[PDB]
Design a binder for this molecule. Structure first.
Ligand SMILES: OC[C@H]1O[C@H](OC[C@H]2O[C@H](O)[C@H](O)[C@@H](O)[C@@H]2O)[C@H](O)[C@@H](O)[C@@H]1O
Ligand SMILES: OC[C@H]1O[C@H](O)[C@H](O)[C@@H](O)[C@@H]1O
Ligand SMILES: [Ca+2]
Ligand code: NA
Length: 1038
């Protein structure tokens, strides 16, 4: 058998196991690779091409020889068969070429020849028939089997002609994947059958007990597994019964596919264990591959004897040799290539794996894992917030945070008062609804504005957070940030008109209208920002790093951050800004004077990260101080806003108790109210007769005004007392400006300017004569609410002001006194004096430090393992637990409430391993259609830490006794955002929820996969948990 000469001297081949003649295929025998004809089966020697190197031409691959000439057609290169266009010599990858008047497929990875294709079709058409898709050829006949259709590899079931979509399929000993559109790719070539010989039978496992195998997880075997065989070939010579000390690697005796087996033989050859000129390819006869593996095993046993051990073998197969990835990691099925990272729905970390169920994984299965919101995955280990036990644990943690001082040191003035729900749209609605009911039970926020306004909570979303807007349990983000991004933050010539600032609209739904706002309790309670720790900041700091160093987020060091931050602030301080927003003061002037919003100041707009906390003031500092100071003293009453014929935005507040322009107001009103004039065109010039007006209203006739902000040539002049330039209203309450100075006072004229602080125009005007302690704010009342809403947008809510008190890119403290939390406490009275009523602290959880995302590289507190560790023993980035308690006390003693950033979405760096069923998925929690399919997967899912062990579940029995309502099932409503098909505006419908009852007697002392929805991709591959790929059956120990 094998290669046999016929009666006319011609060569033919017969498969060494089956005896079938080779026709229309390639076969590697000895050192040589032959083709055998599809007609008579006549051999053809394909010359081995060694030397040369892979090339480029204008943009594709070729291969050039020893004499630098470009090779064409079929080529036998170092044990692979490749095809190069017969004219340009451009390498074919992922397609078919004709040879011997039939079709062969060359895979998309390396262009290797891997299989036969039945036909290639261009002229047929798809049909829908008996509930299926099929393909009919040019004679209207159904096409069957593995084919190409219009250049795409596809498969149609042989019996029916039904097209296969979203499945892995075995065709003639090769495994492919066909995506959601039926488009195909090669995965691997299968092994035929294992050596049934006496040698192989000695290699069978001693038994199926766990003591016979290692590197196992939950009873499953992995690529790293070593095992005890029945017998051992001691010394390379003598079969003996194995002992309990004999262990050998499973991948010396068994391979998941042919590609791995061939790669193994060649690797071993290259490292001394096989001496031969024989070539091992995908076209080698399986018999010869099986035999050569046995010869490798002989040589291993000889070396095990010489070395008195297996430590050399551990290294050879499983560790990086010469900077190269290990043998295991070189294989497709054991690396990230078989996980198909990325895609549009893979927002971070290369995308996600979603957990499912499997009969063999009872300890990781779940009856839950529904997203219950519009998004699901984002980062790291995604917490299943639909799970009843997890929802209880969320109440436990919330309780812990809201009583942190009481619990850790008996200090009742050192507890958080409100929350931020981080990544709200990525957690199940039941947990959000239940969280709001907790705040209701604990603080009676629903009773009146006086209770609600003591606990002003917020979420990271707009109107889409339907559980947050249905009863206005928390503030949503207004559309101001997005609107200002269109009309103010861009360079000259890239801003839209300011008419987009007149209404606050979220996908066509009105949040509040500024044009003529004389009402109260109409607007959706909201916060307005321009920047945040993660809104409009990273991307720009990243561009700065790159011009500065060459690095970016995927590779940057601590020195490179510092270098990037130097360039960042240098840019920020110039007129012409390569990376920074324009018109920041003007945007803050809008934020701080608009009616029906609670503004939130960002730390980073006031201070610079090229210094320690609060050390370096930003260029915008004086202007934002001046704006906060004037808001406290003057801003109350109604609003009007319009854009005039010169493009200038004119905004007026009338002052306390004046809702309209025609309101005569009361005696408090006369010295309150203000006027704001903004332009976004730095070349604005008025003619000599043009006027710009502010209609201050009927309470402000014949009245002197004074500047708070004026645009100057170089920047902005700021004034915090009545010693400033002045101007007078006429008998209707109108202020009138022009291109002339008023009474010779510099910077009172209207004109476009370009400087570091403004690109267009900014002025702010307040009535003269306020007392030194005038406070235009409105106190909350104890009056009972009757409309079902927790928060109401009115003068009292408008009187609050939030401070986001951190940045991602702040540096590490070098001393106690530099720690953020120690500096905050010391500066408490500064915040109170600015009118901050809510201090939003960073998340205080200890960072995982694992560098798998930005959060765990600059250690901001969003990426943690132990969510109860708030700086016990050694500090977080911001301080120790004792510092945190002192900060909360200091803020409370300066009349602020303090907000806890509650991060229910994920947990990082859980070192303990488990096995779970997994499929590729995106942020929406939709199954992606990838070659990974659905595989059992070794996840990093078990852990938590010392404070979770100490505190998780500890308060549940007492919470159930005090607020039993929280542990019951409950019916509820919420708004749901729908996207229209025809590209018109999203629209809101009312959804119904029914949360489940939850238990008080199961604690989550450590995370594990049964409490998780999934994980970011880990790079182990589609086949690191071992199975028989012929029938799909996992190896599992009993
Ligand atoms: O390194 C030799 C290599 O050169 C070409 O492929 C390069 C590169 O092409 C794709 O991006 C693949 O995904 C990579 O794995 C490849 O290394 C030839 O096409 C290939 O035949 C050869 O191995
Ligand atoms: O060309 C249009 C499409 O028609 C059918 O839906 C086929 O299943 C698909 O493979 C093809 O892409
Ligand atoms: Ca989630
Ligand atoms: Na509290």
């Amino acid at each position: 058998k094998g290669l046999r000469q016929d009666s006319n001297g011609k060569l033919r081949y017969f498969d060494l196991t089956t005896g079938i003649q080779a026709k229309g295929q390639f076969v590697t025998i000895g050192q040589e690779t032959y083709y055998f004809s599809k007609d008579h089966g006549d051999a053809q020697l394909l010359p081995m091409v060694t030397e040369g190197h892979y090339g480029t031409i204008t943009t594709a691959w070729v291969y050039r020889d020893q004499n630098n000439t470009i090779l064409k057609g079929l080529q036998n290169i170092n044990g692979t068969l490749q095809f190069f266009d017969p004219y340009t010599g451009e390498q074919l990858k992922g397609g078919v070429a004709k040879y011997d008047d039939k079709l062969f497929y060359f895979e998309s990875g390396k262009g290797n020849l891997v299989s036969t294709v039945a036909g290639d079709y261009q002229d047929g058409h798809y049909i829908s028939q008996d509930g299926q898709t099929r393909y009919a050829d040019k004679q209207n006949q159904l096409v069957k089997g593995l084919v190409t259709v219009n250049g795409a590899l596809q498969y149609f079931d042989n019996a029916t002609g039904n097209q296969i979509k979203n499945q892995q399929v075995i065709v003639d000993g090769k495994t492919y994947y066909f995506d959601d559109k039926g488009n195909g790719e090669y995965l691997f070539t299968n092994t035929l059958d294992m050596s049934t010989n006496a040698f192989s039978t000695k290699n069978v496992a001693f038994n199926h007990d766990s003591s016979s195998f290692d590197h196992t997880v939950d009873g499953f075997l992995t690529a790293d597994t070593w095992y005890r065989p029945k017998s051992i070939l001691a010394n390379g010579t003598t079969w003996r019964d194995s002992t309990d000390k004999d262990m050998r690697p499973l991948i010396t005796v068994w391979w998941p596919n042919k590609n791995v087996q061939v790669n193994y033989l060649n690797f071993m050859k290259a490292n001394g264990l096989l001496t031969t000129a024989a070539q091992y390819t995908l076209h080698s006869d399986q018999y010869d591959l099986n035999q050569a593996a046995q010869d490798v095993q002989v040589a291993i046993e000889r070396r095990i004897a010489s070395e008195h051990g297996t430590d050399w073998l551990q290294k050879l197969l499983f560790e990086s040799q010469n900077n190269n990835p290990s043998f295991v990691k070189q294989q497709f099925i054991w690396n990230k290539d078989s996980e198909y990272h990325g895609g549009g729905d893979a927002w971070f970390q290369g995308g996600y794996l979603k957990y499912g169920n499997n009969p063999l994984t009872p300890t990781t299965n779940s009856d839950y894992r529904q997203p219950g919101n519009a998004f699901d995955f984002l980062l790291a280990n995604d917490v299943d917030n639909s799970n009843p036990v997890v929802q209880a644990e969320n109440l436990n943690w919330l309780h812990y945070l809201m009583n942190f001082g009481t619990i850790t040191a008996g200090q009742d003035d050192a507890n958080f008062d409100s929350i931020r729900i981080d990544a709200v749209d990525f957690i199940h609605n039941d947990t959000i609804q239940r969280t709001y009911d907790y705040l209701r039970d604990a603080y009676q926020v629903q009773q009146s504005e006086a209770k609600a306004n003591q606990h002003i909570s917020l979420v990271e979303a707009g109107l889409d957070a339907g559980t947050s807007t249905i009863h206005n349990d928390a503030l949503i983000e207004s559309n101001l940030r997005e609107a200002a991004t269109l009309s103010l933050t861009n360079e000259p010539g890239k801003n839209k008109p300011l008419t987009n600032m007149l209404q606050d609209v979220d996908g066509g739904t009105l949040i509040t209208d500024h044009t003529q706002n004389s009402t109260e309790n109409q607007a959706t309670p909201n916060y307005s920002i321009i920047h945040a720790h993660d809104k409009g900041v990273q991307e720009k700091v990243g561009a700065a790093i790159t011009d500065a160093t060459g690095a970016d987020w995927t590779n940057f060091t601590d020195e490179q951050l510092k270098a990037g931050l130097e360039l960042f602030y240098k840019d920020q301080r110039a007129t012409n800004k390569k990376y920074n927003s324009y018109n920041i003061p003007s945007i803050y002037a809008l934020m701080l004077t608009n009616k029906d919003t609670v503004p939130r100041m960002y730390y980073g707009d006031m201070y610079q990260d090229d210094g320690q906390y609060m050390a370096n003031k930003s260029i915008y500092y004086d202007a934002l101080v001046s704006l906060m100071t004037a808001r406290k003293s003057y801003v109350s009453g109604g609003q009007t806003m319009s854009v005039d014929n010169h493009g200038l935005l004119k905004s007026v507040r009338f002052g306390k108790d004046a809702m309209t322009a025609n309101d005569l107001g009361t005696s408090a009103t006369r010295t309150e109210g203000l006027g704001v004039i903004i332009g976004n065109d730095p070349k604005l010039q008025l003619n000599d007769s043009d006027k710009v007006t502010l209609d201050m209203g009927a309470a402000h006739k014949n009245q002197k005004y004074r500047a708070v902000i004026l645009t100057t040539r170089d920047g902005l002049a700021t004034f915090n007392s009545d010693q400033a330039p002045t101007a007078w209203t006429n008998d209707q309450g109108t202020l009138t400006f022009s291109n002339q100075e008023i009474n010779g006072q510099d910077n009172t004229q209207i004109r476009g300017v370009a400087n570091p602080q403004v690109s267009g125009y900014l002025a702010v005007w307040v009535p003269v004569g306020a007392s030194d302690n005038q406070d235009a704010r409105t106190a909350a009342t104890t009056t009972e609410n009757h409309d079902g809403k927790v928060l109401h947008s009115n003068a009292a809510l408008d009187s609050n002001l939030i401070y986001e008190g951190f940045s991602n890119f702040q540096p590490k403290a070098t001393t106690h006194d530099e720690l953020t939390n120690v500096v905050i406490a010391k500066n408490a009275d500064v915040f109170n004096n600015w009118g901050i009523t809510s201090f939003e602290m960073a998340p205080q959880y200890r960072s995982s430090g694992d560098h798998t995302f930005l959060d765990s590289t600059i250690d901001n507190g969003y990426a943690f393992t132990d969510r109860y560790d708030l700086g016990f023993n050694t500090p977080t980035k911001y301080g120790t637990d004792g510092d945190l308690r002192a900060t909360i006390q200091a803020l409370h003693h300066a009349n602020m409430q303090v907000m806890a950033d509650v991060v229910d979405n994920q947990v990082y760096n859980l070192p303990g391993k488990e096995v779970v069923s997994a499929t590729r998925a995106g942020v929406y929690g939709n199954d992606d259609a990838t070659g990974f399919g659905t595989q059992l997967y070794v996840t990093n899912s078990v852990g938590g830490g010392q404070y979770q062990e100490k505190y998780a579940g500890q308060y549940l029995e007492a919470l159930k006794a005090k607020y039993p309502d929280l542990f019951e099932g409950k019916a509820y409503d919420y708004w749901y955002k729908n996207y229209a098909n025809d590209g018109s505006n999203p629209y809101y419908t009312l959804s119904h929820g029914d949360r489940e009852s939850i238990p008080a007697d199961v604690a989550i002392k450590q995370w594990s996969a049964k409490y998780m929805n999934g994980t970011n991709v880990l790079g182990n591959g589609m086949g690191y948990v071992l199975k028989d790929w012929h029938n799909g059956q996992y190896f599992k120990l009993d």
